[PDB]
Amino acid sequence: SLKQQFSTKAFQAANLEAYKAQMKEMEESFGALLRQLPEVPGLLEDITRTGLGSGLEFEEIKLLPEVAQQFYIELPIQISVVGGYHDLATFVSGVSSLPRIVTLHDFEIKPVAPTSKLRMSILAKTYRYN
Amino acid sequence: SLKQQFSTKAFQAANLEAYKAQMKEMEESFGALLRQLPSDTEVPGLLEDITRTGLGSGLEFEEIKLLPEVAQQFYIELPIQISVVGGYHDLATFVSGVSSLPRIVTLHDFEIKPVAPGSTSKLRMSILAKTYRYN
């Protein structure tokens, strides 16, 4: 994750306590924007609509346990779909550009039969203020 | 991007003026972090790690395409399009290894295609990565 990339590079910072404070302010601001905003049912709706519009079949949508940070909470959603190569791609971009706070993460893929179909499982995350 | 997502959603903010001010503080903080780093020097090192991660996953590289920089107020994004070829497991481990690198790099849209008819052991993936530097 971004936060992990910054922590990892912390040794490189000219001023370590200032870098730690900039990381914290970044998260706090993120937390404050989420609080400002009115999503999960609507996100689920948007994701399924995106995938159906792309010609995919859904299999499961797993809501995983929330993971709290100090200022925001992640809600991971594991999405399994199946369809053709291009359709998987239009699903991926449709979802990453939704009018939602949603990020995409690791995926795994496997053929339906050892072209056309591929099965994709992808991790998405949405967020709320802590 | 994340910023496009908050922008898109701005009409929904209880107080627009305050929401914009927080978008701007998140951005400013992101830029202050990049400036504490030697991030205006990280591209060649990034490319080196990406390449090694790809090779480590049993992939071959076809192309690395550096796209035009896009400036925001406090940071500049540098989009890098990567084309690789290999097996289905190897592609996912590659994506996973890049995202676990000690670099400020985000991964975005990707598209996969088989190289040849009847083949599933060689797939071509194009993926967009981005890195960032202080503006």
PDB file of C-alpha atoms in Angstrom:
ATOM      1  CA  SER A   1       0.000   0.000   0.000  1.00  0.00           C
ATOM      2  CA  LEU A   2       1.089   3.627  -0.302  1.00  0.00           C
ATOM      3  CA  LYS A   3       1.510   3.981   3.462  1.00  0.00           C
ATOM      4  CA  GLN A   4       3.723   0.907   3.476  1.00  0.00           C
ATOM      5  CA  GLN A   5       5.839   2.339   0.635  1.00  0.00           C
ATOM      6  CA  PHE A   6       6.371   5.561   2.566  1.00  0.00           C
ATOM      7  CA  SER A   7       7.214   3.744   5.886  1.00  0.00           C
ATOM      8  CA  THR A   8       9.698   1.592   4.055  1.00  0.00           C
ATOM      9  CA  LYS A   9      11.449   4.628   2.580  1.00  0.00           C
ATOM     10  CA  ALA A  10      11.460   6.514   5.901  1.00  0.00           C
ATOM     11  CA  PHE A  11      15.215   5.924   6.451  1.00  0.00           C
ATOM     12  CA  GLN A  12      15.849   8.146   3.408  1.00  0.00           C
ATOM     13  CA  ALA A  13      14.043  11.201   4.828  1.00  0.00           C
ATOM     14  CA  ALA A  14      16.212  14.251   5.607  1.00  0.00           C
ATOM     15  CA  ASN A  15      14.197  14.723   8.827  1.00  0.00           C
ATOM     16  CA  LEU A  16      12.590  11.591  10.287  1.00  0.00           C
ATOM     17  CA  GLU A  17      10.112  13.232  12.718  1.00  0.00           C
ATOM     18  CA  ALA A  18       8.974  15.668  10.016  1.00  0.00           C
ATOM     19  CA  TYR A  19       8.411  12.760   7.576  1.00  0.00           C
ATOM     20  CA  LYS A  20       6.405  10.879  10.253  1.00  0.00           C
ATOM     21  CA  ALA A  21       4.276  14.065  10.768  1.00  0.00           C
ATOM     22  CA  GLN A  22       3.716  14.457   7.000  1.00  0.00           C
ATOM     23  CA  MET A  23       2.609  10.801   6.754  1.00  0.00           C
ATOM     24  CA  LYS A  24       0.165  11.393   9.655  1.00  0.00           C
ATOM     25  CA  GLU A  25      -1.261  14.611   8.141  1.00  0.00           C
ATOM     26  CA  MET A  26      -1.737  12.781   4.843  1.00  0.00           C
ATOM     27  CA  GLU A  27      -3.865  10.097   6.561  1.00  0.00           C
ATOM     28  CA  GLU A  28      -5.749  12.680   8.626  1.00  0.00           C
ATOM     29  CA  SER A  29      -6.727  14.622   5.512  1.00  0.00           C
ATOM     30  CA  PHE A  30      -7.784  11.380   3.848  1.00  0.00           C
ATOM     31  CA  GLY A  31      -9.876  10.657   6.991  1.00  0.00           C
ATOM     32  CA  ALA A  32     -11.419  14.164   6.866  1.00  0.00           C
ATOM     33  CA  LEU A  33     -12.489  13.859   3.185  1.00  0.00           C
ATOM     34  CA  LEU A  34     -14.212  10.508   3.825  1.00  0.00           C
ATOM     35  CA  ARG A  35     -16.102  12.099   6.771  1.00  0.00           C
ATOM     36  CA  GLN A  36     -17.199  15.024   4.541  1.00  0.00           C
ATOM     37  CA  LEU A  37     -18.874  12.606   2.098  1.00  0.00           C
ATOM     38  CA  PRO A  38     -22.373  11.092   2.515  1.00  0.00           C
ATOM     39  CA  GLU A  39     -21.683   4.003  -0.131  1.00  0.00           C
ATOM     40  CA  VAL A  40     -21.241   0.214   0.231  1.00  0.00           C
ATOM     41  CA  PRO A  41     -24.612  -0.858  -1.282  1.00  0.00           C
ATOM     42  CA  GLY A  42     -24.065   1.695  -4.085  1.00  0.00           C
ATOM     43  CA  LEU A  43     -20.487   0.514  -4.635  1.00  0.00           C
ATOM     44  CA  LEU A  44     -21.716  -3.072  -4.821  1.00  0.00           C
ATOM     45  CA  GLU A  45     -24.365  -1.906  -7.320  1.00  0.00           C
ATOM     46  CA  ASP A  46     -21.772  -0.016  -9.416  1.00  0.00           C
ATOM     47  CA  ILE A  47     -19.298  -2.951  -9.470  1.00  0.00           C
ATOM     48  CA  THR A  48     -21.960  -5.490 -10.522  1.00  0.00           C
ATOM     49  CA  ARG A  49     -23.344  -3.121 -13.141  1.00  0.00           C
ATOM     50  CA  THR A  50     -19.842  -2.535 -14.502  1.00  0.00           C
ATOM     51  CA  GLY A  51     -19.142  -6.263 -14.779  1.00  0.00           C
ATOM     52  CA  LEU A  52     -22.516  -7.109 -16.272  1.00  0.00           C
ATOM     53  CA  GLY A  53     -22.167  -4.267 -18.803  1.00  0.00           C
ATOM     54  CA  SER A  54     -18.779  -5.702 -19.773  1.00  0.00           C
ATOM     55  CA  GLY A  55     -20.265  -9.159 -20.548  1.00  0.00           C
ATOM     56  CA  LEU A  56     -18.811 -10.874 -17.473  1.00  0.00           C
ATOM     57  CA  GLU A  57     -20.286 -13.500 -15.211  1.00  0.00           C
ATOM     58  CA  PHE A  58     -19.955 -12.856 -11.473  1.00  0.00           C
ATOM     59  CA  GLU A  59     -19.285 -15.691  -9.115  1.00  0.00           C
ATOM     60  CA  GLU A  60     -18.684 -14.194  -5.706  1.00  0.00           C
ATOM     61  CA  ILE A  61     -18.307 -10.937  -3.940  1.00  0.00           C
ATOM     62  CA  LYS A  62     -16.734 -11.522  -0.513  1.00  0.00           C
ATOM     63  CA  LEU A  63     -16.772  -8.763   2.079  1.00  0.00           C
ATOM     64  CA  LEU A  64     -13.618  -9.334   4.156  1.00  0.00           C
ATOM     65  CA  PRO A  65     -13.017  -8.110   7.746  1.00  0.00           C
ATOM     66  CA  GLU A  66     -12.362  -4.346   7.959  1.00  0.00           C
ATOM     67  CA  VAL A  67      -8.819  -3.164   8.738  1.00  0.00           C
ATOM     68  CA  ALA A  68      -8.571   0.026  10.813  1.00  0.00           C
ATOM     69  CA  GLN A  69      -5.893   2.675  10.609  1.00  0.00           C
ATOM     70  CA  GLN A  70      -5.942   5.640  12.993  1.00  0.00           C
ATOM     71  CA  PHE A  71      -7.945   7.997  10.726  1.00  0.00           C
ATOM     72  CA  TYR A  72      -9.761   5.672   8.237  1.00  0.00           C
ATOM     73  CA  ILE A  73     -10.996   2.076   7.940  1.00  0.00           C
ATOM     74  CA  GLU A  74     -10.416  -0.131   4.831  1.00  0.00           C
ATOM     75  CA  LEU A  75     -13.197  -2.437   3.632  1.00  0.00           C
ATOM     76  CA  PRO A  76     -11.708  -5.134   1.412  1.00  0.00           C
ATOM     77  CA  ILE A  77     -13.968  -6.730  -1.183  1.00  0.00           C
ATOM     78  CA  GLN A  78     -12.850  -9.814  -3.020  1.00  0.00           C
ATOM     79  CA  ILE A  79     -14.470  -9.985  -6.461  1.00  0.00           C
ATOM     80  CA  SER A  80     -14.499 -13.153  -8.674  1.00  0.00           C
ATOM     81  CA  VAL A  81     -15.665 -12.861 -12.242  1.00  0.00           C
ATOM     82  CA  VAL A  82     -15.289 -14.768 -15.516  1.00  0.00           C
ATOM     83  CA  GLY A  83     -15.281 -13.633 -19.143  1.00  0.00           C
ATOM     84  CA  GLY A  84     -13.056 -12.859 -22.087  1.00  0.00           C
ATOM     85  CA  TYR A  85      -9.704 -11.076 -21.988  1.00  0.00           C
ATOM     86  CA  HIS A  86     -10.880  -7.653 -23.216  1.00  0.00           C
ATOM     87  CA  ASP A  87     -14.099  -7.732 -21.176  1.00  0.00           C
ATOM     88  CA  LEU A  88     -12.018  -8.353 -18.018  1.00  0.00           C
ATOM     89  CA  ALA A  89     -10.002  -5.264 -19.016  1.00  0.00           C
ATOM     90  CA  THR A  90     -13.038  -2.976 -19.528  1.00  0.00           C
ATOM     91  CA  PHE A  91     -14.369  -4.201 -16.139  1.00  0.00           C
ATOM     92  CA  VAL A  92     -11.063  -3.305 -14.498  1.00  0.00           C
ATOM     93  CA  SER A  93     -11.028   0.276 -15.931  1.00  0.00           C
ATOM     94  CA  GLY A  94     -14.760   0.800 -15.418  1.00  0.00           C
ATOM     95  CA  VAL A  95     -14.294  -0.029 -11.738  1.00  0.00           C
ATOM     96  CA  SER A  96     -11.100   1.972 -11.176  1.00  0.00           C
ATOM     97  CA  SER A  97     -12.807   5.101 -12.559  1.00  0.00           C
ATOM     98  CA  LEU A  98     -16.125   4.814 -10.610  1.00  0.00           C
ATOM     99  CA  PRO A  99     -17.497   7.852  -8.826  1.00  0.00           C
ATOM    100  CA  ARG A 100     -16.548   6.051  -5.576  1.00  0.00           C
ATOM    101  CA  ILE A 101     -13.536   5.899  -3.320  1.00  0.00           C
ATOM    102  CA  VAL A 102     -12.353   2.496  -4.523  1.00  0.00           C
ATOM    103  CA  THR A 103      -8.881   1.085  -5.117  1.00  0.00           C
ATOM    104  CA  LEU A 104      -7.843  -2.135  -6.830  1.00  0.00           C
ATOM    105  CA  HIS A 105      -5.075  -4.386  -5.559  1.00  0.00           C
ATOM    106  CA  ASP A 106      -3.714  -7.915  -6.307  1.00  0.00           C
ATOM    107  CA  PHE A 107      -5.478 -10.333  -8.613  1.00  0.00           C
ATOM    108  CA  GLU A 108      -5.174 -13.980  -9.577  1.00  0.00           C
ATOM    109  CA  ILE A 109      -6.193 -15.438 -12.929  1.00  0.00           C
ATOM    110  CA  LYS A 110      -6.719 -18.909 -14.367  1.00  0.00           C
ATOM    111  CA  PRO A 111      -8.144 -20.255 -17.650  1.00  0.00           C
ATOM    112  CA  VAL A 112     -11.593 -21.791 -17.651  1.00  0.00           C
ATOM    113  CA  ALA A 113      -9.970 -24.498 -19.867  1.00  0.00           C
ATOM    114  CA  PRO A 114      -6.164 -25.166 -19.716  1.00  0.00           C
ATOM    115  CA  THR A 115      -8.405 -18.029 -25.518  1.00  0.00           C
ATOM    116  CA  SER A 116     -11.885 -16.725 -24.642  1.00  0.00           C
ATOM    117  CA  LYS A 117     -12.440 -17.297 -20.947  1.00  0.00           C
ATOM    118  CA  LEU A 118     -10.251 -16.438 -18.003  1.00  0.00           C
ATOM    119  CA  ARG A 119     -11.325 -16.544 -14.343  1.00  0.00           C
ATOM    120  CA  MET A 120     -10.209 -13.492 -12.369  1.00  0.00           C
ATOM    121  CA  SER A 121     -10.289 -12.917  -8.674  1.00  0.00           C
ATOM    122  CA  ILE A 122      -9.395  -9.308  -7.729  1.00  0.00           C
ATOM    123  CA  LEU A 123      -9.145  -7.488  -4.366  1.00  0.00           C
ATOM    124  CA  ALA A 124     -10.855  -4.084  -4.191  1.00  0.00           C
ATOM    125  CA  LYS A 125     -10.876  -1.728  -1.230  1.00  0.00           C
ATOM    126  CA  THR A 126     -13.159   1.071  -0.153  1.00  0.00           C
ATOM    127  CA  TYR A 127     -12.724   3.245   2.921  1.00  0.00           C
ATOM    128  CA  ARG A 128     -14.480   5.137   5.696  1.00  0.00           C
ATOM    129  CA  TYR A 129     -13.404   7.599   8.386  1.00  0.00           C
ATOM    130  CA  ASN A 130     -12.407   5.883  11.656  1.00  0.00           C
TER     131      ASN A 130
ATOM    132  CA  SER B   1      -6.731   8.469  -9.883  1.00  0.00           C
ATOM    133  CA  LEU B   2      -7.696   8.895  -6.207  1.00  0.00           C
ATOM    134  CA  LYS B   3      -7.763  12.705  -6.723  1.00  0.00           C
ATOM    135  CA  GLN B   4     -10.094  12.324  -9.696  1.00  0.00           C
ATOM    136  CA  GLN B   5     -12.348  10.246  -7.437  1.00  0.00           C
ATOM    137  CA  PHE B   6     -12.460  12.945  -4.703  1.00  0.00           C
ATOM    138  CA  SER B   7     -12.963  15.615  -7.433  1.00  0.00           C
ATOM    139  CA  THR B   8     -15.783  13.690  -9.015  1.00  0.00           C
ATOM    140  CA  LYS B   9     -17.378  13.341  -5.555  1.00  0.00           C
ATOM    141  CA  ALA B  10     -16.939  17.007  -4.500  1.00  0.00           C
ATOM    142  CA  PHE B  11     -20.597  17.978  -5.168  1.00  0.00           C
ATOM    143  CA  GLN B  12     -21.423  15.487  -2.337  1.00  0.00           C
ATOM    144  CA  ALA B  13     -19.331  17.223   0.312  1.00  0.00           C
ATOM    145  CA  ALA B  14     -21.341  18.682   3.196  1.00  0.00           C
ATOM    146  CA  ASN B  15     -19.141  21.802   2.891  1.00  0.00           C
ATOM    147  CA  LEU B  16     -17.396  22.227  -0.492  1.00  0.00           C
ATOM    148  CA  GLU B  17     -15.012  24.946   0.671  1.00  0.00           C
ATOM    149  CA  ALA B  18     -13.773  22.747   3.557  1.00  0.00           C
ATOM    150  CA  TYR B  19     -13.534  19.606   1.314  1.00  0.00           C
ATOM    151  CA  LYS B  20     -11.403  21.372  -1.291  1.00  0.00           C
ATOM    152  CA  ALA B  21      -9.175  22.638   1.530  1.00  0.00           C
ATOM    153  CA  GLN B  22      -8.649  19.057   2.732  1.00  0.00           C
ATOM    154  CA  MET B  23      -7.997  17.769  -0.830  1.00  0.00           C
ATOM    155  CA  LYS B  24      -5.339  20.505  -1.019  1.00  0.00           C
ATOM    156  CA  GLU B  25      -3.778  19.504   2.387  1.00  0.00           C
ATOM    157  CA  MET B  26      -3.648  15.791   1.414  1.00  0.00           C
ATOM    158  CA  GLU B  27      -1.918  16.832  -1.827  1.00  0.00           C
ATOM    159  CA  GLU B  28       0.454  19.233  -0.069  1.00  0.00           C
ATOM    160  CA  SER B  29       1.377  16.508   2.428  1.00  0.00           C
ATOM    161  CA  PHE B  30       1.945  14.021  -0.380  1.00  0.00           C
ATOM    162  CA  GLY B  31       4.321  16.530  -2.049  1.00  0.00           C
ATOM    163  CA  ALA B  32       6.107  17.300   1.253  1.00  0.00           C
ATOM    164  CA  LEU B  33       6.782  13.536   1.630  1.00  0.00           C
ATOM    165  CA  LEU B  34       8.135  13.221  -1.902  1.00  0.00           C
ATOM    166  CA  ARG B  35      10.413  16.264  -1.360  1.00  0.00           C
ATOM    167  CA  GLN B  36      11.891  14.662   1.809  1.00  0.00           C
ATOM    168  CA  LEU B  37      12.926  11.806  -0.479  1.00  0.00           C
ATOM    169  CA  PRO B  38      15.243  11.770  -3.524  1.00  0.00           C
ATOM    170  CA  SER B  39      12.120  11.017  -5.651  1.00  0.00           C
ATOM    171  CA  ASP B  40      13.327  13.140  -8.621  1.00  0.00           C
ATOM    172  CA  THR B  41      16.028  10.420  -8.974  1.00  0.00           C
ATOM    173  CA  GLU B  42      13.881   7.330  -8.442  1.00  0.00           C
ATOM    174  CA  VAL B  43      12.755   6.554 -12.024  1.00  0.00           C
ATOM    175  CA  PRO B  44      15.907   4.673 -13.137  1.00  0.00           C
ATOM    176  CA  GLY B  45      15.997   2.744  -9.858  1.00  0.00           C
ATOM    177  CA  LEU B  46      12.282   2.035 -10.210  1.00  0.00           C
ATOM    178  CA  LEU B  47      12.811   0.680 -13.740  1.00  0.00           C
ATOM    179  CA  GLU B  48      15.665  -1.456 -12.478  1.00  0.00           C
ATOM    180  CA  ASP B  49      13.458  -2.983  -9.700  1.00  0.00           C
ATOM    181  CA  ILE B  50      10.496  -3.488 -12.002  1.00  0.00           C
ATOM    182  CA  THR B  51      12.781  -5.281 -14.490  1.00  0.00           C
ATOM    183  CA  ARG B  52      14.378  -7.488 -11.879  1.00  0.00           C
ATOM    184  CA  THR B  53      10.945  -8.332 -10.383  1.00  0.00           C
ATOM    185  CA  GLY B  54       9.698  -9.293 -13.846  1.00  0.00           C
ATOM    186  CA  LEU B  55      12.760 -11.428 -14.566  1.00  0.00           C
ATOM    187  CA  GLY B  56      12.399 -12.943 -11.044  1.00  0.00           C
ATOM    188  CA  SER B  57       8.852 -13.957 -11.916  1.00  0.00           C
ATOM    189  CA  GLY B  58       9.899 -15.710 -15.148  1.00  0.00           C
ATOM    190  CA  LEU B  59       8.539 -13.002 -17.403  1.00  0.00           C
ATOM    191  CA  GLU B  60      10.070 -11.458 -20.511  1.00  0.00           C
ATOM    192  CA  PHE B  61       9.928  -7.700 -21.061  1.00  0.00           C
ATOM    193  CA  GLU B  62       8.844  -6.387 -24.419  1.00  0.00           C
ATOM    194  CA  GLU B  63       8.535  -2.664 -23.774  1.00  0.00           C
ATOM    195  CA  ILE B  64       8.681   0.106 -21.211  1.00  0.00           C
ATOM    196  CA  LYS B  65       6.932   3.192 -22.382  1.00  0.00           C
ATOM    197  CA  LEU B  66       7.347   6.424 -20.475  1.00  0.00           C
ATOM    198  CA  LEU B  67       4.374   8.649 -21.057  1.00  0.00           C
ATOM    199  CA  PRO B  68       4.054  12.468 -20.680  1.00  0.00           C
ATOM    200  CA  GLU B  69       4.322  13.835 -17.110  1.00  0.00           C
ATOM    201  CA  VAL B  70       1.148  15.260 -15.598  1.00  0.00           C
ATOM    202  CA  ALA B  71       1.572  18.076 -13.106  1.00  0.00           C
ATOM    203  CA  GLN B  72      -0.725  18.773 -10.180  1.00  0.00           C
ATOM    204  CA  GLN B  73      -0.075  21.621  -7.767  1.00  0.00           C
ATOM    205  CA  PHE B  74       2.320  19.862  -5.368  1.00  0.00           C
ATOM    206  CA  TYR B  75       3.423  16.733  -7.235  1.00  0.00           C
ATOM    207  CA  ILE B  76       3.972  15.495 -10.757  1.00  0.00           C
ATOM    208  CA  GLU B  77       2.934  12.028 -11.899  1.00  0.00           C
ATOM    209  CA  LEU B  78       5.033   9.993 -14.280  1.00  0.00           C
ATOM    210  CA  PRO B  79       3.029   7.224 -16.072  1.00  0.00           C
ATOM    211  CA  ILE B  80       4.973   4.156 -17.173  1.00  0.00           C
ATOM    212  CA  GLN B  81       3.325   1.552 -19.394  1.00  0.00           C
ATOM    213  CA  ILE B  82       4.829  -1.933 -19.064  1.00  0.00           C
ATOM    214  CA  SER B  83       4.426  -4.805 -21.565  1.00  0.00           C
ATOM    215  CA  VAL B  84       5.462  -8.262 -20.406  1.00  0.00           C
ATOM    216  CA  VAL B  85       4.869 -11.861 -21.586  1.00  0.00           C
ATOM    217  CA  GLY B  86       4.651 -15.050 -19.486  1.00  0.00           C
ATOM    218  CA  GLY B  87       2.369 -17.511 -17.643  1.00  0.00           C
ATOM    219  CA  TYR B  88      -0.783 -16.643 -15.733  1.00  0.00           C
ATOM    220  CA  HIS B  89       0.602 -17.214 -12.198  1.00  0.00           C
ATOM    221  CA  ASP B  90       3.848 -15.378 -13.037  1.00  0.00           C
ATOM    222  CA  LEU B  91       1.968 -12.251 -14.188  1.00  0.00           C
ATOM    223  CA  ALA B  92       0.099 -12.004 -10.854  1.00  0.00           C
ATOM    224  CA  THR B  93       3.233 -12.528  -8.744  1.00  0.00           C
ATOM    225  CA  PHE B  94       4.983  -9.846 -10.829  1.00  0.00           C
ATOM    226  CA  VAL B  95       2.122  -7.386 -10.146  1.00  0.00           C
ATOM    227  CA  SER B  96       2.266  -8.323  -6.479  1.00  0.00           C
ATOM    228  CA  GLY B  97       6.086  -7.936  -6.274  1.00  0.00           C
ATOM    229  CA  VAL B  98       6.066  -4.498  -7.927  1.00  0.00           C
ATOM    230  CA  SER B  99       3.423  -3.295  -5.486  1.00  0.00           C
ATOM    231  CA  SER B 100       5.583  -4.541  -2.556  1.00  0.00           C
ATOM    232  CA  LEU B 101       8.689  -2.598  -3.725  1.00  0.00           C
ATOM    233  CA  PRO B 102      10.401  -0.003  -1.497  1.00  0.00           C
ATOM    234  CA  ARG B 103       9.370   2.693  -4.017  1.00  0.00           C
ATOM    235  CA  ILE B 104       6.474   5.140  -4.367  1.00  0.00           C
ATOM    236  CA  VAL B 105       4.752   3.329  -7.240  1.00  0.00           C
ATOM    237  CA  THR B 106       1.055   2.725  -7.854  1.00  0.00           C
ATOM    238  CA  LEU B 107      -0.434   0.239 -10.310  1.00  0.00           C
ATOM    239  CA  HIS B 108      -3.471   0.958 -12.457  1.00  0.00           C
ATOM    240  CA  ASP B 109      -5.350  -0.520 -15.400  1.00  0.00           C
ATOM    241  CA  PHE B 110      -4.006  -3.651 -17.045  1.00  0.00           C
ATOM    242  CA  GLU B 111      -5.045  -5.789 -19.996  1.00  0.00           C
ATOM    243  CA  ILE B 112      -4.098  -9.364 -20.808  1.00  0.00           C
ATOM    244  CA  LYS B 113      -4.026 -11.190 -24.134  1.00  0.00           C
ATOM    245  CA  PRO B 114      -2.762 -14.649 -25.249  1.00  0.00           C
ATOM    246  CA  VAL B 115       0.285 -14.504 -27.528  1.00  0.00           C
ATOM    247  CA  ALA B 116      -0.763 -17.394 -29.766  1.00  0.00           C
ATOM    248  CA  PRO B 117      -3.917 -19.442 -30.649  1.00  0.00           C
ATOM    249  CA  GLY B 118      -4.382 -22.458 -28.334  1.00  0.00           C
ATOM    250  CA  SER B 119      -1.815 -21.078 -25.853  1.00  0.00           C
ATOM    251  CA  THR B 120      -2.386 -20.242 -22.212  1.00  0.00           C
ATOM    252  CA  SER B 121       1.263 -20.618 -21.031  1.00  0.00           C
ATOM    253  CA  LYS B 122       2.308 -17.406 -22.773  1.00  0.00           C
ATOM    254  CA  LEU B 123       0.145 -14.342 -22.075  1.00  0.00           C
ATOM    255  CA  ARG B 124       0.890 -10.727 -22.890  1.00  0.00           C
ATOM    256  CA  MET B 125       0.017  -8.147 -20.212  1.00  0.00           C
ATOM    257  CA  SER B 126       0.110  -4.378 -20.613  1.00  0.00           C
ATOM    258  CA  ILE B 127      -0.055  -2.535 -17.243  1.00  0.00           C
ATOM    259  CA  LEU B 128       0.103   1.137 -16.277  1.00  0.00           C
ATOM    260  CA  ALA B 129       2.366   2.042 -13.328  1.00  0.00           C
ATOM    261  CA  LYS B 130       2.881   5.548 -11.967  1.00  0.00           C
ATOM    262  CA  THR B 131       5.468   7.215  -9.956  1.00  0.00           C
ATOM    263  CA  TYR B 132       5.549  10.720  -8.552  1.00  0.00           C
ATOM    264  CA  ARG B 133       7.876  13.580  -7.694  1.00  0.00           C
ATOM    265  CA  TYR B 134       7.527  16.911  -5.889  1.00  0.00           C
ATOM    266  CA  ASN B 135       6.302  19.680  -8.219  1.00  0.00           C
TER     267      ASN B 135
END
